[PDB]
Symmetry: D3
Subunit: 322 residues, 6 copies
């Protein structure tokens, strides 16, 4: 045991979505391991190692679907583990954890700035862009395009149940970007006036499928019907290593009361069930490009990003297992 | 000029959606004419006739998209106009208005029952049915399938911005039918487990397109993707005669405060526009059948229903114009 | 109650597929009703009427999927019933039965000849044609185009489990048409070289779907994939009136021993089940035209054949019912 | 014999395409029969009848693909024939021919004006319309839309080999309509900025296929890919009766030297063949509506226009055969 | 010149399909080369080298379509050839042959086990799986998912003309997996109820096409129609190196008497030809993933398996050539 | 600053299309640098270097869309820049420019031959091949197929506005190959009889899209519709490196007088604009393979060619910028 309160508070804030967005959650988890190592009262390497193992498990068991979270945890603990097994002493192990965490956080920020600069080259002056949910990676693209002087407009879908569209609409409007807010249902009706679709990712699989906020796959479907480019802005740590060896991504089922508030739901007949999937799966055929910090790829090149950057680890257990 | 308060009240309630659903609005318009004729203090036929024309205009000018409304007005008013011009006296004209209105209302009730009987024969034991918005015609189908003892389950989409799915869920649950409630964005995600889609219509056009609650076209699109039958339950007075001669159906744009309540919306910046189309257009390639009170048709036979039942009137002006 | 042995022979032969093919089965039922009438030793009209109702039920209950059978029984019995109810005497009723039967039989032959003539105009010199099962209407198209001097070749699919393709291969070779015989599985491999697909039908529904020998829909699907014309050759009595009011066509499931001979099947373990659907459903989007004895139609005009030839009868009970 | 020179000159001008456009050719053929009857020196009904038979055959054997030509001929000669067989005398037969011709010509003009008014309701302010070849029916639609004050632009495809696009571009520009001229190859590249496609027809078949100028089917294909409405403006006399009974429309193969001028072609190697099909076939699935003078139809309703207006004649020989 | 009888037995058994299945055939060829080496009575290395070149040619020339066979021969002979050319003595060369053969055989077994493990993670409790032919790699996926406690059912297609489905049905039943056996023609009818499709492969090409038992491509086509996952279970030695430099894979045509027994076939007329393709080509757009022993890939990454595992060898002649 | 006349002449000829075809233009640009270095009167390395940079800019600024040009310039100029900066003397820098240019030219010639050899293996005896514009790479494929004795016929599309098909027709005829010449609009009409499509490329992008002569995308579209293979013959220097980082490829808009000659065009009204894009974009879903000098790839592996061969240079500015 001996876990710092910031670890428990971060885990709780991921679970409740007080902190959300797959990148933000990954950085928050890195930031928690960092604070555990900063404040630990461990005397021994053995002790701190075991704390970080435990902190890591607590953070992993918060929300399952966005692989950014375990990838952040892995980034920090592959390096902490290797230091430990190599015989590092207390302060060397501590610094390894703190510095790996800071590396992940810095690289996450840079990757998003770079995704914006790359994706903005695909955005043309006059473009109407449709988006979904709230993705910092997607917003980075739209924001850089606007800063380049391209006169754009963003159609923002409200993204039920949690209303993520409101966040997006207000953020974009605050940079000076003109916004059209519509309900999710209206996505097809307005796909004809749309030039480009720019969305985020929580996990991208080996076969090129993108797992993102519920409703994503519908927008991609009708963008494809209408020949509107579907561009997924996503960091390489959105790529899902275990899909290489056949693993299915768990789709997170969140609380019914996030759809129908508890005051109302309790009055409803028992033979109504409310189902609240937080994500869906978009097949690669409905995706034109994935914009990563290292460049544009077709969706079927996702296996390459995973082979080159993640494959080596799959013959090992997780770096926080005993 | 001497218009009774019920005509005004009916109209206000149509505009505000306190009275809603295509068939219901049609019935209420006929009723309101019925009441104008029952309570008229007119002493001459010309004077009654003039009241019925003005009331028809008030009722016509409430909500555009659902052709059931003008079709109801025409049902009554063609018969009223023929009687006025053939020399009917006051009491004869009055009765023609009342009785035509009654016929329209009664025929509407029977047509929804018959649609149920016919559609229910396409529902099989164990079917998972997805629906959208709240359609009395679609519900008649599902209710009758259940009464025949077929064990069905209905996936009900929330139907933002007005939350029509709530109505549908509770109504279907009340008859004994299990319901799964989902946000609109989840319709693709659950199309794999769906056997049948059953929705209603506000207007059906000469080439077989169905105009229905915003989001309908998305559900039909992914249904077709998945080889799930799309059935549209629709009375013959949902068919739109002006489309035979090239008319485009106006899609109603409703208040943005139905999407974002006024308190919230006034705090938003000027450069976010909220757009709130109440309907969309589903093309005929994504519809398998239309279930009318006269039987099952491919959507491409919408023209036949229009020719044989409404075409005759297209050489004439509206039966309420001077 | 006094049913001649020929009715029972006919029913048994229909059941075992010793008599088969939708047109033939229909003709045999009309034949059976004719012989019941000829050989009846009834003395009063009611006693003959009872025999004919009962013989019709026996015939109707043999094989459910091809509607040609009940359309034949109806052709006769509508006429017999109307005669009986107008107070027809015994010999008048007898002869109505016999003459209505003869007339269905003659018209069926003529219809098949005329489908031949109309269908052959769509076959072009040099054409390679793929067929499925053994359909006398389809063979009529092919035999006629060859008689006009067009150098055609026909690809005959084996049509498991009953090997219908063997019947078709031998018949077509017998007229001097060169045949390529292939297993069903090869239909896609050879679709590239196929110019036209020509198949029959057992029932055609109000929305334009064609129910025909199991496998038909696979062939139509890859035909449409390859932009190869799919032409269905079908008499007007293959159109299914009950589908206008929502009825589903029942797919006959036949004995598993037609797939795996009993001698072999009883050695197999109990946890292997053999499913033997005799028909499948091809949707109308994969059918280019239906060739009837009255002309070429798009599949979507099946509802017109039905409205015009059969819809009158739907408001009544079956003419063999009490 | 005894055919007036205007018959030979008209036939020659159809063959050389000095007169072209399916409507114009049909009116020209009517106008020729008219002038034969006006100027004939026949003494006897028998004589004039036989002249008109012969005039008719000369006109029919000019160009095969646009059924407007035989339909015009039929319009005149069904009535001339019936008069003759009914015993009409010389001047009565003469007037029957002259008046039938004038009827056809007047109705053709009205049908085109009416097609424009109907189709223009489908054109929206701001629309970019793409067209192909030169169709008076299509131009009628675009012209009426512009006269209504809709700010439109027409993308005109050049329509090789004969450059019909130039005619269209100059005609539209002369009404004040802004035009973009592009090569045929550029149709896909500009389909994204296109709102609507409006083209003509030479023949429309029973199954809903449209035969129009070579390249039509490509534009329809990519309009369908991009969800751009394909609207075919066409008079009911563009509908092809013999397709009801299985007839394939001949695709006219015009002279190689219309593609490669003779001065150049003679210098080319003998193993180059130039193929010059004047038309192609557009499947109904790629057509949204057909706009006739009697209203909007889906393409699959073409069989109805043919059943109701032309079927009765198919059991007779042509009205100019012996 | 001195080839042991086991090489000839193996070749004959491959030819007659007494030994069959792409992996098995490959293992048997490696086995045959091993035994030639063990039993050789050669005294010099050149004499053994000559025997092994010749035995390889004998084996290569049995059945052309499955590349597993030449990839096995290559695995051994590349190694044997390199040993020979480095001046290996007789026993060194013998043992290189024997040990290279053993090693291909062991790795093949391991690969199939591991495909099982990786593929099983994509099968979910409750799944209905459709397969085709008899593939040990596909069966490995299915047997493992069942061993993990997932309640699956498998739909086995008959796989004419050789009835491979019987082998598969009995094998799967033997492990306690419930089986539904159907004719090939029924694959579309039952695709609605199928959750996953899992098949093997004989060769996989550089652009991602899968050549497998005749019928495979029909199944994949209607699977994609219905949004059912198509998963191909295939060892890395099913990838076809020669296709990287443009080679087409030859489709074996086998004896017509495998379709129609000789006893029956010689009674048939000469103008019926029986075509018996053993394989067909499924394009990569209809394949969701390939499961190899090194992981899951999109079909489009077949070129990477090839570049990385085999492309080195392409600049040389076959290792059994002179 | 002292630029030789050949650099200027080369540039004029590129702009005017007296020199055209992607590979040819690349070769001519390398040649022009070669000549500048051969004839330079520079006395210092800096001075030569400056000449080569200015010449590179002049050559770069001729025509945008075909990346072969800048790729050729880079080939030479990277090597020149590395030599300048590593201290090379005048004669060493001169030779580096000459010899790099020679290598590029020689490698281009070999690559087109190799592409022929590889592509020709996908062409089968009796194939009808459709091509578009004039591509040396595509022609190498067809020429080699013929030399192998495969009896092929080539459908050559006219390729307006510049009539490139004329060149193609005459060239292919000269080698012995029969040709059918058609207008671009006829490509769909003849896609039924086509076995293979073989075209070239000007640029291939990171996601697998091919930019090629205007109209290419239409032919690929209807080819896919028809299950006709679309093969793109393209050297690795057709691959576009800037697209890895989001760059959009500029489509060249050429003089309208290439479409309508100047004499005609000046007589046209102001409100006709002639638009003349020289290229379009074909998406990767409509391409089956790309045939490079290193082998056959799916279009989705374009990224691999870009990564391994061009990616290294993207951190640096152009090797001709100051
Ligand atoms: N549901 C799901 N599909 C996945 C996953 N990883 C890859 N896929 C692939 O994503 C595709 C989904 O296609 P769909 O079924 O949505 O139309 C399939 O090809 C499937 O094999 C995963 O974790 N979950
Ligand atoms: N299974 C079935 N489908 C029918 C019947 N009548 C009409 N259909 C129609 O056939 C089509 C089947 O399309 P599929 O689901 O096979 O892709 C649907 O449009 C459905 O409405 C019937 O009796 N059975
Ligand atoms: N070529 C041709 N097709 C016709 C004609 N009449 C109807 N069709 C129909 O038009 C469609 C053409 O489809 P496609 O082969 O172009 O993709 C087919 O369904 C065919 O049966 C005709 O005269 N010629
Ligand atoms: N028939 C055949 N197709 C191959 C082969 N290698 C790759 N392919 C590819 O397989 C695909 C076949 O698609 P289909 O024509 O069956 O619709 C094409 O994209 C083609 O380029 C081969 O050896 N044979
Ligand atoms: O009426 P005709 O055109 O001969 O055949 C129509 C259809 O009826 C047959 O069914 P079965 O063999 O009786 O099960 C075949 O499926 C055939 O296509
Ligand atoms: K074909
Ligand atoms: K399914």
């Amino acid at each position: 045991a001996m876990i710092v309160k910031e670890v428990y508070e971060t885990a709780e804030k991921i679970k409740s979505m007080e902190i959300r967005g797959a990148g933000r959650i990954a950085r928050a988890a890195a930031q928690a391991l960092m604070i555990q190592a900063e404040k630990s009262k461990a005397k021994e390497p053995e002790e701190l190692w075991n704390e970080l193992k435990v902190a890591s498990k607590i953070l992993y068991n918060t929300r399952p679907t966005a692989v950014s979270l375990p990838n952040a945890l892995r980034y920090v603990m592959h390096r902490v583990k290797a230091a430990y097994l190599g015989g590092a002493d207390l302060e060397t192990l501590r610094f390894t954890a703190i510095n790996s965490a800071k590396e992940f956080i810095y690289n996450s920020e840079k990757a998003i700035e770079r995704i914006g600069e790359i994706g903005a080259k695909r955005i043309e002056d006059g473009d109407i862009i449709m988006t979904h949910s709230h993705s910092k990676a997607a917003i980075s693209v739209m924001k850089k395009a606007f800063e380049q002087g391209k006169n754009i407009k963003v159609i923002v879908t409200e993204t039920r149940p949690k209303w993520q569209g409101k966040i997006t609409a207000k953020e974009l409007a605050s940079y000076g970007i003109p916004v059209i807010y519509i309900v999710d249902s209206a996505a097809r009706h307005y796909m004809k006036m749309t030039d480009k679709v720019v969305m985020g990712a929580d996990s991208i699989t080996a076969n090129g499928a993108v797992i993102n906020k519920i409703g994503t796959s519908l927008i991609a479907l009708t963008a494809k019907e209408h020949r509107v480019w579907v561009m997924i802005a996503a960091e390489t740590y959105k790529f899902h290593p275990a899909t290489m060896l056949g693993q299915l991504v768990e789709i997170e089922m969140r609380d019914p009361t996030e759809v129908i508030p508890e005051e109302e739901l309790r009055t409803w007949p028992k033979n109504i069930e409310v189902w609240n999937p937080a994500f869906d799966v978009t097949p690669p055929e409905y995706i034109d490009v994935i914009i990563t910090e290292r460049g544009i790829i077709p969706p079927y090149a996702a296996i390459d990003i995973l082979k080159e950057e993640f494959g080596w680890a799959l013959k090992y257990k997780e770096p926080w297992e005993d």
